Amino acid sequence: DIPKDRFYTKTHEWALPEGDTVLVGITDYAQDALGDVVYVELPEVGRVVEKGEAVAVVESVKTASDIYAPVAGEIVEVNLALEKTPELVNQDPYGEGWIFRLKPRDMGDLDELLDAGGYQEVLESEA
């Protein structure tokens, strides 16, 4: 399951472009590997983050996973619903399970990410 409406990351993350921003969450593959999610550490809104910086932690019943900032920019929103219902990450990783909204320091940076095809090659490469 790899929708082609967003960018992807080798660290199994996605960035949904929406105007001058991008929604961020983990891939279906990512939550399958993690198992039931029980808690999500969210980054403070307004922080300026650099590309690759660990800014979120998804805690499941198997391990804790550091979520990185696909590209440099600022956190403009955090998915509060993940505090009361973390499992949304499993149920709908690409939808209601988004983690944070990030505004790229520069959109052109997204063009350095992978597309549905790039991410699939990656999953098949490490199969």
UniProtKB/Swiss-Prot annotation:
The keyword Cell inner membrane does not apply. GO terms for biological process: glycine decarboxylation via glycine cleavage system. Residues 21-103 form the Lipoyl-binding domain. Its cofactor is (R)-lipoate. The modification N6-lipoyllysine is found at K62. Binds 1 lipoyl cofactor covalently. InterPro entries: 2-oxoA_DH_lipoyl-BS, Biotin_lipoyl, GCV_H, GCV_H/Fam206, GCV_H_sub, Single_hybrid_motif. The glycine cleavage system catalyzes the degradation of glycine. The H protein shuttles the methylamine group of glycine from the P protein to the T protein. This is Glycine cleavage system H protein. The lineage of its organism: Bacteria, Thermotogati, Deinococcota, Deinococci, Thermales.
